Amino acid sequence: PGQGRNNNGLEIGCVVDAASGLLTFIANGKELSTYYQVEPSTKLFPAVFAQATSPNVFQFELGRIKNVMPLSAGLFKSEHKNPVPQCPPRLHVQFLS
Amino acid sequence: NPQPVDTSNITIPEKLEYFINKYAEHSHDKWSMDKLANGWIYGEIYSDSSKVQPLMKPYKLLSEKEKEIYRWPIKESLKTMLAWGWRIERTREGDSMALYNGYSPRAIDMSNVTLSRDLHAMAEMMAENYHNIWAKKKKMELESKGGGNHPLLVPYDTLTAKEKAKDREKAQDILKFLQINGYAVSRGFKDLELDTPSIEKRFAYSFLQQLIRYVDEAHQYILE
Amino acid sequence: RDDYDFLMQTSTYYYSVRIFPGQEPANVWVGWIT
Amino acid sequence: CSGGHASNKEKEMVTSLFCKLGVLVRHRISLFGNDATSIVNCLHILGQT
């Protein structure tokens, strides 16, 4: 729709299928047309490239949607079967320098 | 003695009607937010003691008579902004939403919206106009009263940050809402042509031209 | 709401990014990198 | 190299300054009320310029 989105900050949702390699993106509750198919054993790092136009730019919301594991259940082996989203201290934001 | 930039002659274009709208709406929304924060309630009678407000109905249910004087500051703001010649360009997504088409307590948190520093100088100087308007009206009121002086009547740069705060923040909120709408605001004109190749364009050449002219005048004086 | 059996047997993972209001979305890219 | 380049028009008109003030100060030290030292300083620095 463009323009007004202030009802809630633009929520781009990244969905990864580790069994098929399908990369689908959810934007404000609707699936986007762009999809990426990757090859087996690919290690994908969650990443955001942004140019700062405000003091608050973006936020890594580590959560879950209906019928999907959170990112922690895939990142960590000890939390493989835990549907509750988590953010252990090991995970942290890195920047290219 | 401050003169505000007069703009009574200038008129708003029709393409700015769509901007006049939704800003009538947004100002009504934020005014209702302030009222509900103060405990104002939707009551048909406007009694201050019981805190019942008949203006809580949405903008569409609001009457046009109170929509005037309401739209008045918005009208003068856009009029003055155009009076400098500054141009605003509307983007396609605006008309897309146009054709797309109890009370509603949704408001926009505009604090994190940021303008450029050019837009900041823009807002500062147009806000200086706003302070000049206020100073002119207060000067007229005070000379009519014939006695007194006001501490904030001092010149704009003489005002402090907290004193400027109201005028500045209303300046940014209007220009930021404009930017998020997509009306591309810029200065009236851009440099048609600058004579950079001019050898006299530099300071040194003009200085030494003045110097040689004055020293030759002094020469014919000294001959005299 | 969500089916626990499907939910435990699935291998799909999700994270989301909130672009804050006032930050131009055209200057923000979201996804995965290797 | 960060700028600081007078044009050749600059330099020719500077030479015009030098020549014209020489013409002025030709035998006029008596008229100059002891500022003749200022003229002498000015002509040195111009000679270096």
UniProtKB/Swiss-Prot annotation, chain A:
Entry's induction text: By TGFB1.
> What is its subcellular localisation?
Sarcoplasmic reticulum membrane
What is the annotated tissue distribution of the protein whose record heads this document?
Answer: Detected in heart muscle (at protein level). Heart muscle, brain (cerebellum and hippocampus) and placenta.
Superkingdom of the source? Answer: Eukaryota
Q: How is it modified after translation?
A: Channel activity is modulated by phosphorylation. Phosphorylation is increased in failing heart, leading to calcium leaks and increased cytoplasmic Ca(2+) levels.
Family in the record: Belongs to the ryanodine receptor (TC 1.A.3.1) family. RYR2 subfamily.
The domain comment in this protein's record states: The calcium release channel activity resides in the C-terminal region while the remaining part of the protein resides in the cytoplasm.
Its assembly, as annotated, is: Homotetramer. Can also form heterotetramers with RYR1 and RYR3. Interacts with FKBP1A and FKBP1B; these interactions may stabilize the channel in its closed state and prevent Ca(2+) leaks. Interacts with CALM and S100A1; these interactions regulate channel activity. Identified in a complex composed of RYR2, FKBP1B, PKA catalytic subunit, PRKAR2A, AKAP6, and the protein phosphatases PP2A and PP1. Interacts directly with FKBP1B, PKA, PP1 and PP2A. Interacts with SELENON. In cardiac muscles, identified in a complex, composed of FSD2, CMYA5 and RYR2.
Known function: Cytosolic calcium-activated calcium channel that mediates the release of Ca(2+) from the sarcoplasmic reticulum into the cytosol and thereby plays a key role in triggering cardiac muscle contraction. Aberrant channel activation can lead to cardiac arrhythmia. In cardiac myocytes, calcium release is triggered by increased Ca(2+) cytosolic levels due to activation of the L-type calcium channel CACNA1C. The calcium channel activity is modulated by formation of heterotetramers with RYR3. Required for cellular calcium ion homeostasis. Required for embryonic heart development.
Q: Give the disease association.
A: Ventricular tachycardia, catecholaminergic polymorphic, 1, with or without atrial dysfunction and/or dilated cardiomyopathy: An arrhythmogenic disorder characterized by stress-induced, bidirectional ventricular tachycardia that may degenerate into cardiac arrest and cause sudden death. Patients present with recurrent syncope, seizures, or sudden death after physical activity or emotional stress. CPVT1 inheritance is autosomal dominant.
Name of this protein: Ryanodine receptor 2
Q: Which gene encodes it?
A: RYR2
Residue range from the parent sequence: 1496 to 1592 of 4967
From Swiss-Prot, chain C:
Q: Where in the cell is it found?
A: Sarcoplasmic reticulum membrane
Q: What induces it?
A: By TGFB1.
Q: How is it modified after translation?
A: Channel activity is modulated by phosphorylation. Phosphorylation is increased in failing heart, leading to calcium leaks and increased cytoplasmic Ca(2+) levels.
Annotated tissue distribution: Detected in heart muscle (at protein level). Heart muscle, brain (cerebellum and hippocampus) and placenta.
Q: Which disease is it linked to?
A: Ventricular tachycardia, catecholaminergic polymorphic, 1, with or without atrial dysfunction and/or dilated cardiomyopathy: An arrhythmogenic disorder characterized by stress-induced, bidirectional ventricular tachycardia that may degenerate into cardiac arrest and cause sudden death. Patients present with recurrent syncope, seizures, or sudden death after physical activity or emotional stress. CPVT1 inheritance is autosomal dominant. Ventricular arrhythmias due to cardiac ryanodine receptor calcium release deficiency syndrome: An autosomal dominant arrhythmogenic disorder characterized by syncope, cardiac arrest and/or sudden unexpected death, often in association with physical exertion or acute emotional stress. Patients who survive manifest polymorphic ventricular tachycardia and ventricular fibrillation. Unlike typical catecholaminergic ventricular tachycardia, arrhythmias are not reproducible on exercise stress testing or adrenaline challenge.
Described by its record, this protein's role is as follows: Cytosolic calcium-activated calcium channel that mediates the release of Ca(2+) from the sarcoplasmic reticulum into the cytosol and thereby plays a key role in triggering cardiac muscle contraction. Aberrant channel activation can lead to cardiac arrhythmia. In cardiac myocytes, calcium release is triggered by increased Ca(2+) cytosolic levels due to activation of the L-type calcium channel CACNA1C. The calcium channel activity is modulated by formation of heterotetramers with RYR3. Required for cellular calcium ion homeostasis. Required for embryonic heart development.
Summarize the subunit comment. Answer: Homotetramer. Can also form heterotetramers with RYR1 and RYR3. Interacts with FKBP1A and FKBP1B; these interactions may stabilize the channel in its closed state and prevent Ca(2+) leaks. Interacts with CALM and S100A1; these interactions regulate channel activity. Identified in a complex composed of RYR2, FKBP1B, PKA catalytic subunit, PRKAR2A, AKAP6, and the protein phosphatases PP2A and PP1. Interacts directly with FKBP1B, PKA, PP1 and PP2A. Interacts with SELENON. In cardiac muscles, identified in a complex, composed of FSD2, CMYA5 and RYR2.
Instruction: State the similarity comment.
Output: Belongs to the ryanodine receptor (TC 1.A.3.1) family. RYR2 subfamily.
Name of this chain's protein: Ryanodine receptor 2
